[PDB]
Write a protein that binds this ligand. Structure first.
Ligand SMILES: CCCCCCCCCCCCCCCCCC(=O)OC[C@H](COP(=O)([O-])OCC(O)COP(=O)([O-])OC[C@@H](COC(=O)CCCCCCCCCCCCCCCCC)OC(=O)CCCCCCCCCCCCCCCCC)OC(=O)CCCCCCCCCCCCCCCCC
Ligand SMILES: CCCCCCCCCCCCCCCCCC(=O)OC[C@H](COP(=O)([O-])OCC(O)COP(=O)([O-])OC[C@@H](COC(=O)CCCCCCCCCCCCCCCCC)OC(=O)CCCCCCCCCCCCCCCCC)OC(=O)CCCCCCCCCCCCCCCCC
Ligand SMILES: CCCCCCCCCCCCCCCCCC(=O)OC[C@H](COP(=O)([O-])OCC(O)COP(=O)([O-])OC[C@@H](COC(=O)CCCCCCCCCCCCCCCCC)OC(=O)CCCCCCCCCCCCCCCCC)OC(=O)CCCCCCCCCCCCCCCCC
Ligand SMILES: CCCCCCCCCCCCCCCCCC(=O)OC[C@H](COP(=O)([O-])OCC[N+](C)(C)C)OC(=O)CCCCCCCCCCCCCCCCC
Ligand SMILES: CCCCCCCCCCCCCCCCCC(=O)OC[C@H](COP(=O)(O)OCCN)OC(=O)CCCCCCCCCCCCCCCCC
Ligand SMILES: CCCCCCCCCCCCCCCCCC(=O)OC[C@H](COP(=O)(O)OCCN)OC(=O)CCCCCCCCCCCCCCCCC
Ligand SMILES: CCCCCCCCCCCCCCCCCC(=O)OC[C@H](COP(=O)(O)OCCN)OC(=O)CCCCCCCCCCCCCCCCC
Ligand SMILES: CCCCCCCCCCCCCCCCCC(=O)OC[C@H](COP(=O)(O)OCCN)OC(=O)CCCCCCCCCCCCCCCCC
Ligand SMILES: CCCCCCCCCCCCO[C@@H]1O[C@H](CO)[C@@H](O[C@H]2O[C@H](CO)[C@@H](O)[C@H](O)[C@H]2O)[C@H](O)[C@H]1O
Lengths: 175, 98, 171, 347, 83, 318, 106, 48
């Protein structure tokens, strides 16, 4: 069962998404996204993306989601309605888990399902690469190349972040 | 395609449906927007990592950075809405009806 | 599509070098100097052919050269060598710099009893040239014939006949 | 805003669009849209009122959703082709997603609801940017991926846009809402011809921008945002009423004015491809737009609506708004039909 | 000048943290262009062999390509040993 | 075997935290011309045990929480993350040898701010929530310098591997080439862990600081243990980062003894500082970060990117 | 496997300590007591410190690969773009500083 | 001091990387035989 770690994680990934997509109180919506993000990083790690995975934790969870929860406390929620105590929220949550359960049922049984795209249920391990013996991390080499190959990317990305600071100060001044 | 893609694509679809079906809180809809980006980040990373597209390894970072900056802008607008009305309810944003 | 051709199990059979990585690491510098020729022929084959099935004979010669290399050490320098790779093996990173004393004893032994000189810093990373009789592969990618390009447009540019010819316009 | 910061923000709006237009890589196209959206929000918020905040929020939600769908299409395209080149997409699902994403960005029907509301909620100068410059980047992308676009989808979006734009404008008294529905209707012409001749998409876009720019500039010159406030112009600046009349007739597509040219050239291209029913339907439906342009000309130029006593005080002061390029734009908006063959410079 | 020196005195008295910050940043941007050892950083990075050095097929006329790693021809790392 | 290793890390961590509470009271006592605990056990050695038993059999506080799930999640998160921060530390060998161990520690600490936010949300008090938000703003502000300072030091180390910091300092402590970064790092760790003079959660300027105010909270002991585990861990990280201990592969225990002494001394300096200074105002500690540390940290980051290149001292990648 | 076991063990113990911290007091059986969204109002300044942290934190994401970036052959390009990023990070601070984005006075 | 030590570490790295290069031909030859044997074995079970 450990040989299907990626698939099991992706099932939890979808369940968390059905969590905040049914849109309970924003406080618990942030919790569903935080769990999904942590599971999402786990999936990326198991494909050899150690740096990319840790960026999710550092920047997406430790950065963006902290600010979401910060803003939710100040501007949105201070106490929440009990999760799944609302008709639409619970009905949406039940509907999502039924769709996920059936997708998982048919993919495991028939080893293949077809919705828009054709999906194979042999196991995500079968597509992996069989040749690895370099003395470095390919992922790290590709990211490090941002400063040599990606001059233009750095300029526009750097400009956008600076403009973000300016714009948000403009927006929030109020006059 | 491999089995994992089915679930990542489901997650994007779920968060997209969650984005298009509002309730009341504008905040709850912004979370669905960030959920969409998270699923894109994961699907992009899986495709790039598995194929050994080395120079594309930086693309998920740029995606995350630009989407977080756009999320900061969204949160700022939500705060300005909450200042005007005292809540982030989307039903108060109906002046332009006329 | 065709049937993928694979060699028989008997065709793949060779006497392996059943020593640990610390043993290989300890001998690596002398092994690189002594067995350069068959090793470089094998690597030229692998990069030119891009097919492991096309280099199995050269791959066997890599093993035989390695086995004869270690038989020379077992014959004249076993005890100094055994001491050297046992130190290398202790380190979790198998660091050279922790075992310079035992390395010197092994290097001194092989120089006296075999004439082997340890290659200098930078030598084993040189691009070298190898003599080979294997002909250069002609179509290593097995490419089909390329599609023919579209006919070139040539000649002198002349003004359009009667102008744009757009509805009623005379120019 | 500090004027220097206002200049930097406008230059960033332009930079985002320029990045989309020179990029050969899908990631850089997406970045250009992100940069563009970030820089335009402040100019929408700049007058600080609840209506401007609602419009900014509605615009942000629409554009962010579109940009996520665009990225989804790019990633699907990567999975099925292993490359990032801005060109025809290699998966029909990716094509549909990107086409819908770009339709949402353009405000095409049935993704149109935000255009009337967002335009109404922001100043005239911001609306001018929104309805002219903001069309350039999505059009430049559609111009490059059109070979892979589903024909039925793009023509359906075009027909709906022409119908909704025409009908939506009939019920409007607000100038900014009229220009928003006019933009939606004119959008449908540009995309309708795209499968057949993308050069005529560019022609219609350029002429639409010139005429729309002329209209907004004249509305800004007198600070008019409603039909009845525009009906006072005859008793302040009579020349402006004549210029407004000529431009509105041009936007109506009446010969011999410039606005007829794009309709004329699009009809020609569609008929060359044995498309007879669709151009005839489009031409007839465009009469809806002519109707609510003509209604404006009635209240502005061809009759004289009642004035107010305090209008006499305005007679004593000159127009001091810049009205940049207005004399040139109004001439191009009306008197260019004799130079129609010059459209080949767009080829 | 002396106006310039007075200004440097006022900031050094009121904003020593910022004076130090701009001084350190200025050195960061200037010294690399002036240093003679910057060239060695590029050379060392290029002397690090991450990939196997694929041998060349000996056509018969590459005098400057060594046939064996210990032959004299080819790039040397003598400068690095001394550095 | 690995399960033994985990418990031989977790249990001693909890015992060190317990007896750090005694060391703090006695060190603060003697700097204040008194003794501190010396009645409950010889030299107060049983005082941590008496406090622990007393706290766990105390009645739970009132009022009731606003969110039961968040009320329970916050202490689990605080303590779970606190223990997790220890697993990559090389002492000299790590429990988990990560290639990106430094980044792992950054990532895990950035998640510690959630327990503050969740406990404020679950406090059912408007004023208690505002206090939590001020604490979060302080924490994230000083996370900026910790990340940038850490990045600057790694430009001399060459990788994100924690055990590579040991090799980097084989000849010399990194505090010599990087004492300006060490100074700001050490203060940032104080402010990050809400330690005096940055302990505004325990200060006099909060809306909830009033003694007669009440809000849902607790258990006190679990939050306290999590905080003090982070104090020790940060000071262990500080020693590894700037005061690297020499490692002899044949005598690893010598590394551990010398490494433990340095960590203890750094931890004692936290107690030293708490005894010596008044408390910052909230706006003043924000000013310290945004208008002092951050400008200087950015400048020193520029310097440490340039310095290895211009001196031809770029470290190895592996 | 080991990392998963460590994380599971750490958060399992934290969970047990939490529940027994909540159950053990019930052994005493203490007497019953019988005696006891919207803006906060939130200051814009506290929102703006969080946003500034985020935007600065995103720029730090771009700087994290610097230790690896220094191993490249194109050092001049790498150093130019590294200093470019840090300088724009400084320019963001300078803009915030000179428009009183870092003040706490109302 | 940091400069001298990092220069020496770069020299040590080159030594470690060159030991790998010396061994890569042997490792490559083994890997090819191992891969081809596994494929041949899979084929035999496929025929059955
Ligand atoms: C102020 C005056 C400024 C001009 C003087 C400047 C002097 C310096 C230049 C030197 C010079 O004299 O040589 C250049 C030029 C003469 O050049 P040429 O080589 O010696 O001989 C040219 C041949 O005559 C003709 O040779 P061609 O036939 O081979 O080439 C002409 C050809 C290609 O040339 C063109 O496309 C340009 C056509 C216009 C050029 C005429 C000069 C422009 C300046 C006057 C504009 C006045 C506008 C009137 C406004 C009316 C109110 C609405 O024409 C076409 O194919 C286009 C067909 C007409 C397009 C109609 C589109 C329908 C919608 C518009 C209808 C509106 C009513 C018409 C008014 C708009 C003007 C058409 O100057 C002229 O004398 C122009 C004469 C008129 C020629 C027009 C061609 C027949 C079309 C009749 C259209 C009816 C309008 C006629 C207007 C005439 C008013 C005077
Ligand atoms: C780089 C190369 C040079 C390009 C320069 C790029 C723009 C930066 C300079 C403009 C800012 C400035 O200098 O003054 C700031 C200054 C800020 O100080 P402030 O008075 O305290 O602030 C007042 C408000 O901020 C603003 O005052 P307001 O609210 O009372 O109204 C301002 C209004 C007043 O402006 C007017 O006088 C009315 C005429 C403006 C429309 C005409 C533009 C051209 C129309 C298309 C034809 C192509 C030419 O100007 C605007 O609407 C701003 C947007 C202008 C661009 C409209 C987009 C046109 C579509 C371009 C399509 C091109 C492809 C076609 C195929 O205010 C102004 O002066 C704004 C007017 C600037 C001069 C006229 C507009 C710029 C010239 C047209 C450039 C066309 C290139 C496309 C631009 C796309 C931008 C997204
Ligand atoms: C290649 C270049 C060839 C084109 C030359 C373009 C030069 C035009 C520069 C005119 C100018 O200063 O623009 C100021 C202009 C402000 O004046 P405006 O609001 O556009 O209206 C004219 C004023 O009455 C004018 O106000 P003003 O009283 O201050 O006029 C004095 C002005 C002289 O300015 C003028 O005389 C304005 C009239 C110039 C022509 C307007 C531009 C037309 C550009 C050609 C359009 C192509 C039409 C399409 C081709 C035909 C169809 C195929 O003196 C100058 O600045 C000399 C220009 C120095 C260079 O603002 C801008 O153009 C830049 C913002
Ligand atoms: C829960 C509450 C908060 C605690 C979460 C702790 C972090 C999660 C674990 C991630 C660890 C990590 O990235 O280390 C990289 C580390 C270090 O990476 P590395 O590259 O340094 O070392 C890997 C091994 N080498 C170098 C040889 C290639 O990765 C590993 O050690 C291997 C990971 C194996 C696969 C893990 C699968 C499970 C992942 C689950 C993620 C969390 C689930 C979500 C939880 C709820 C939401 C937070
Ligand atoms: C096999 C692949 C399938 C891929 C599709 C995957 C996504 C669909 C699976 C569901 C996943 C959970 C997503 C839930 C999002 C919708 C919840 C929501 O936000 O709806 C809000 C709205 C009610 O809003 P409210 O104001 O609170 O109450 C008014 C009603 N009286 O809602 C309502 O009015 C009631 C609706 C509740 C039921 C939701 C049903 C799912 C939405 C329809 C999707 C159809 C297309 C799916 C394909
Ligand atoms: C070149 C080939 C292509 C050909 C296409 C056609 C080209 C023509 C379009 C050009 C663009 C429109 C500009 C036309 C210039 C208009 C000049 C004008 O009408 O005078 C303005 C007049 C002045 O009013 P006042 O300010 O009081 O000044 C008094 C003067 N002592 O203002 C007034 O007195 C108010 C007038 C009352 C309203 C009258 C409404 C009818 C106006 C008829 C002219 C409009 C023509 C546009 C339609 C096209 C016609 C074919
Ligand atoms: C202190 C002066 C004596 C130097 C010293 O600490 O002894 C070194 C000894 C072994 O040296 P070692 O660090 O292993 O090798 C260096 C190569 N990396 O290591 C040891 O003897 C063990 C450490 C005992 C000596 C304490 C050294 C650490 C002192 C840290 C003080 C922290 C002060 C904090 C300042 C802020 C508060 C005011
Ligand atoms: C050879 C000698 C070289 C060194 C000489 C340096 C010359 C002086 C440099 C400038 C000194 C500072 C100028 C100044 O006037 O500072 C005062 C002022 C802060 O005063 P403030 O507290 O905000 O006043 C509010 C009322 N209580 O300042 C301000 O209000 C705005 C200051 C913003 C500065 C932020 C800079 C952040 C970046 C730190 C530096 C990193 C490098 C930046 C890139 C530069 C590369 C060269
Ligand atoms: C196996 C181990 C089990 C865990 C055992 C935990 C034992 C905890 C013993 C704590 C000993 C007392 O330690 C002391 O406690 C008080 C809290 O009342 C702290 O007091 C501090 O926090 C409180 C608020 O929380 C403030 O009101 C006070 O002004 C401040 O000084 C002291 O900073 C600390 O030095």
């Amino acid at each position: 069962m450990m040989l299907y770690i990626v698939f099991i994680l992706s099932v939890i990934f979808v369940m968390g998404f059905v969590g905040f997509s049914s849109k309970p109180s924003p406080i618990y919506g942030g919790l569903g996204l935080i769990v999904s993000g942590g599971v999402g990083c786990g999936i990326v790690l198991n494909f050899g993306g150690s740096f990319l995975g840790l960026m999710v934790f550092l920047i997406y969870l430790g950065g963006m989601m902290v600010v979401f929860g910060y803003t939710t406390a100040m501007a949105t929620e201070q106490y929440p309605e009990i999760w799944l105590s609302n008709k639409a929220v619970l009905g949406a949550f039940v509907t999502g888990l039924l769709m996920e359960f059936f997708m998982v049922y048919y993919v495991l049984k028939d080893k293949e399902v077809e919705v828009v795209f054709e999906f194979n249920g042999l196991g995500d391990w079968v597509i992996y690469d069989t040749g690895d013996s370099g003395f470095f991390s390919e992922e790290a080499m590709g990211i490090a190349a941002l400063y040599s190959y990606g001059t233009w990317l750095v300029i526009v990305t750097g400009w956008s972040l600076l403009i973000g600071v300016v714009v948000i100060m403009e927006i929030t001044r109020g006059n | 395609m491999s089995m994992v893609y089915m679930n990542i694509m489901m997650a994007f679809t779920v968060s997209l449906v969650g984005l298009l079906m509002y309730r009341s809180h504008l905040m709850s809809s912004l979370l669905c927007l960030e959920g969409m980006m998270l699923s894109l980040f994961v699907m992009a990373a899986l495709t790039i990592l598995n194929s050994h597209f080395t120079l594309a390894s930086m693309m998920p970072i740029i995606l995350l950075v630009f989407a977080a900056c756009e999320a900061a802008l969204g949160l700022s607008l939500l705060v300005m809405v909450s200042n005007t009305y005292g809540t982030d309810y989307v039903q108060n944003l109906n002046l332009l009806q006329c | 599509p065709g049937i993928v051709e694979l060699p028989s199990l008997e065709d793949l059979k060779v006497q392996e070098v059943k020593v640990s990585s610390s043993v290989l690491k300890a001998a690596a510098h002398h092994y690189g100097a002594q067995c350069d020729k068959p090793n470089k022929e094998f690597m030229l084959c692998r990069w030119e052919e891009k097919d492991p099935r096309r280099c199995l004979e050269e791959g066997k010669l890599v093993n035989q050269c390695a086995l004869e290399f270690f038989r020379q050490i077992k014959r004249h320098c076993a005890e100094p060598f055994t001491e050297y790779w046992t130190c290398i093996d202790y380190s979790g990173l198998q660091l050279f710099r922790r075992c310079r004393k035992q390395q010197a004893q092994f290097d001194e032994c092989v120089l006296d009893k075999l004439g082997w000189v340890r290659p200098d810093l930078g030598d084993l990373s040189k691009v070298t040239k190898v003599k080979t009789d294997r002909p250069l592969p002609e179509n290593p990618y097995h490419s089909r014939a390329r599609p023919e390009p579209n006919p070139e447009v040539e000649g002198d540019l002349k003004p359009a006949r009667h102008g744009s010819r757009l509805f009623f316009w005379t120019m | 805003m500090n004027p220097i910061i206002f200049i930097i923000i406008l230059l960033t709006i332009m930079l985002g669009t320029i990045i989309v237009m020179i990029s050969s890589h899908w990631l850089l196209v997406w970045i250009g849209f992100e940069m563009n959206m970030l820089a335009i929000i402040p100019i929408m918020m700049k007058n600080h009122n609840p209506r401007a905040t609602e419009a900014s929020t509605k615009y942000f939600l629409t554009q962010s959703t579109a940009s996520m769908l665009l990225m989804m299409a790019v990633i699907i395209n990567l999975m099925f082709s292993g490359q990032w080149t801005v060109m025809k997409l290699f998966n029909p699902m990716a094509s549909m997603l990107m086409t819908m994403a770009l339709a949402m960005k353009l405000g095409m029907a049935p993704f149109h609801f935000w255009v009337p509301e967002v335009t109404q909620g922001i100043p005239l100068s911001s609306g001018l940017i929104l309805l002219t410059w903001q069309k350039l980047a999505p059009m430049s992308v559609l111009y490059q991926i059109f070979p892979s676009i589903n024909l039925n989808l793009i023509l359906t979006l075009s027909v709906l846009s022409i119908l909704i734009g025409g009908w939506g404008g009939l019920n409007q008294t607000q100038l900014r809402k009229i220009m928003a529905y006019s933009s939606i209707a004119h959008m449908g012409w540009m995309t309708a011809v795209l499968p057949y001749n993308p050069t005529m998409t560019l022609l219609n876009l350029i002429i639409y921008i010139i005429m729309t720019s002329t209209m907004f500039t004249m509305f800004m010159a007198n600070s008019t945002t409603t039909t009845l406030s525009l009906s006072h112009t005859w008793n302040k600046t009579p020349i402006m009423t004549v210029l407004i009349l000529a431009t509105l007739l041009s936007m109506g597509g009446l010969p011999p004015l410039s606005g007829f040219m794009p309709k004329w050239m699009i009809i020609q291209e569609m008929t060359k491809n044995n498309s007879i029913i669709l151009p005839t339907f489009m031409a007839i439906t465009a009469l809806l737009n002519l109707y609510f342009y003509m209604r404006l000309t009635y209240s502005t130029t061809l009759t004289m609506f009642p004035s107010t006593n305090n209008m006499k005080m305005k007679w004593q002061f000159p127009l001091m708004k810049k009205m940049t390029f207005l004399p040139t734009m109004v001439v191009l908006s009306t008197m260019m039909l004799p130079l129609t063959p010059m459209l080949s410079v767009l080829e | 000048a002396e106006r310039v020196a007075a200004f440097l005195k006022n900031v050094w008295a009121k904003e020593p943290v910022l004076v130090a910050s701009f001084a350190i940043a200025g050195l960061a941007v200037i010294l690399p262009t002036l240093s003679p050892y910057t060239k060695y950083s590029l050379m060392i990075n290029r002397a690090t062999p991450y990939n196997y050095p694929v041998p060349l097929r000996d056509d018969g006329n590459m005098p400057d390509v060594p046939s064996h790693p210990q032959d004299p021809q080819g790039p040397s790392l003598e400068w690095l040993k001394r550095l | 075997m690995f399960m033994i290793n985990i418990l031989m890390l977790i249990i001693p961590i909890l015992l060190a935290v317990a007896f750090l509470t005694l060391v703090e009271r006695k060190v603060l006592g003697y700097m204040q011309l008194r003794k501190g605990p010396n009645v409950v056990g010889p030299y107060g050695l049983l005082q941590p045990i008496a406090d622990a038993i007393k706290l766990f059999i105390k009645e739970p506080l009132r009022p009731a929480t606003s969110s039961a799930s968040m009320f329970i999640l916050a202490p689990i998160m605080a303590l779970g993350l606190a223990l997790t921060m220890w697993i990559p530390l090389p002492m000299p060998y790590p429990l988990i040898n990560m290639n990106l161990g430094v980044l792992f520690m950054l990532a895990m600490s950035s998640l510690a701010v959630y327990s503050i936010l969740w406990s404020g949300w679950a406090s059912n008090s408007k004023y208690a929530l505002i206090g939590a938000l001020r604490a979060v703003a302080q924490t994230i502000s000083y996370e900026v310098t910790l990340a940038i300072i850490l990045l600057s030091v790694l430009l001399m180390s060459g990788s994100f591997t924690l055990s590579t910091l040991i090799t980097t300092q084989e000849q010399m402590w990194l505090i010599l080439p990087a004492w300006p970064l060490a100074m700001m790092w050490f203060i940032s760790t104080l402010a990050e862990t809400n330690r005096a003079p940055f302990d505004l959660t325990e200060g006099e300027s909060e809306l909830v600081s009033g003694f007669n105010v009440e809000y849902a909270a607790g258990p006190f002991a679990l939050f306290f243990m999590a905080e003090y585990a982070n104090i020790i861990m940060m000071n262990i990280f500080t020693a590894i980062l700037f005061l690297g201990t020499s490692h002899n592969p044949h005598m690893p225990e010598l590394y551990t003894i010398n490494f433990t002494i340095k960590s203890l001394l750094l931890t004692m300096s936290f107690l030293w500082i708490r005894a010596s200074y008044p408390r910052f105002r909230y706006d003043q500690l924000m000013h310290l970060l945004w208008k002092n540390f951050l400008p200087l940290t950015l400048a020193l980051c520029m310097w440490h990117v340039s310095l290895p290149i211009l001196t031809s001292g770029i470290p190895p990648q592996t | 496997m080991n990392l998963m076991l460590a994380l599971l063990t750490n958060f399992t113990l934290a969970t047990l300590l939490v529940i027994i911290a909540f159950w053990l007091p019930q052994l005493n059986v203490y007497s019953e007591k019988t005696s006891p969204s919207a803006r906060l109002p939130f200051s814009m300044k506290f929102f703006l410190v969080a946003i500034t942290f985020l935007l600065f934190d995103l720029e730090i994401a771009l700087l994290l690969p610097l230790p690896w970036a220094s191993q490249t052959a194109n050092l001049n390009t790498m150093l130019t773009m590294a200093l470019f990023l840090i300088i724009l990070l400084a320019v963001s601070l300078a803009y915030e500083w000179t428009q009183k984005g870092l003040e706490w006075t109302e | 001091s940091m400069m001298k030590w990092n220069r020496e570490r770069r020299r040590l790295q080159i030594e470690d990387f060159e030991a790998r290069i010396a061994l890569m031909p042997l490792l490559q030859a083994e890997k090819d035989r191992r891969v081809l044997q596994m494929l041949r074995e899979n084929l035999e079970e496929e025929a059955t």
